[PDB]
Amino acid sequence: MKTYVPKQVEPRWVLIDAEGKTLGRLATKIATLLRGKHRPDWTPNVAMGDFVVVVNADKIRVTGKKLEQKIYTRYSGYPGGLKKIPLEKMLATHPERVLEHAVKGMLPKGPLGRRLFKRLKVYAGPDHPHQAQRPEKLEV
Template sequence: MFRNALRSYKAGTPLKFLQVKGTKDFQPESEGVSGGAGTGEPRRQRSSARPGPAPAAPAPSRRYLRRWLPRARPGPCARPSSAAARSAPWPAGPRRAPLRRSRAAARHRPPQGSASASRGRGRRSLRAPRGMASYSRAAQQWATFGRAWYLLDAKMQPPGKLAAATVIRLEGRHKPIYHALNDCGDHVVIINTRHIAFSGNKWEQKVYSSHTGYPGGFKQVTATQLHLKDPTAIVKLAVYRMLPKNLQRRTLMQRLHLFPEDVIPEDIEKNLLQEIPQPRAVPKRLDEYTPEEIAAFPKVWTPPKDFRRK
């Protein structure tokens, strides 16, 4: 009953059952009957039908539609199937332009009967071109995940540049699968560590310090003293100090193989795969030139025949 009265109130019908007796608008009527003998109107039976629906709400403004309705027009899958609904106007708003191929892409489209067109769009053939050696995906994977062995000649090379080239291979930074926590480094074999070179007067000026941990255990030695005691110590310290300071440093140092001369054990020599180029070009000494190279060398000044050295 209260629900019907609320609907009547929304429709504009006065709520007579809420009129209080003794007020000005109170009119005594029998429930369910309108009119009567005292009013002069014919007695009329009240309809049992429910009141009609409420009037329609005002149409939303154009600004509301632009704000809350999607701007893009739905695709063909979202449209209704009936012809009448399909022809209904869509809400106002800018439409997105359809995607079109550029003229350059359309110009280079393969013909319909070609092999590239039959393979499908966006797919590339994994076969190698004719006249070239095939390099399969499996071979690429083995070369990436396998541990290679590199050779580096330290003759007449500064220890700092040797360490920079070695650390890249030990950590695996030259591989596409490199990660700071991924153990994917390779082995590096360094030969001729006895014949390294320092610039300037670093053999006497450079000092290496150590401490035993006990009182009076602090020691200092020059680069010359350390190199005479152990020909591989300077290169080893340079590589160790350049590696990241974490728990992987000792594991990476186990893949570093140092030799004072060019003599390598046979089991290590069999594993060598590639040679790392020297960081610095080695100059030739005068006694290393052949007589033919000396004769072909351009002369800046030719002394006269009567020239005498004082």
């Protein structure tokens, strides 16, 4: 009686409202659905988590003074190339990249992890071009 492995399953699209939800918590549930660890047929070594689309990423909310005290930094490899970016500016420019950074901070690494991050699609604002994919709305 070997442990069961499922066959390949079509990923079920899932829409998620970025508005009104906390950054960390929402990113948590997003990562959870992304892994497919909501499915009884779950298996680690294969990306069978669901495709996820989010809208109103700008409409995310964050507790405390994290608007400014949270500094998304980057590194160019160049001396003094540490580019600190506060959370506010990062909202004004790339809020979708904010959620990308937060959820990517929670995914398991490795090529499976990167493909999983490909499996996610953020859209700041209320719209997205995936109606053909039938994005199932799912409150969290």
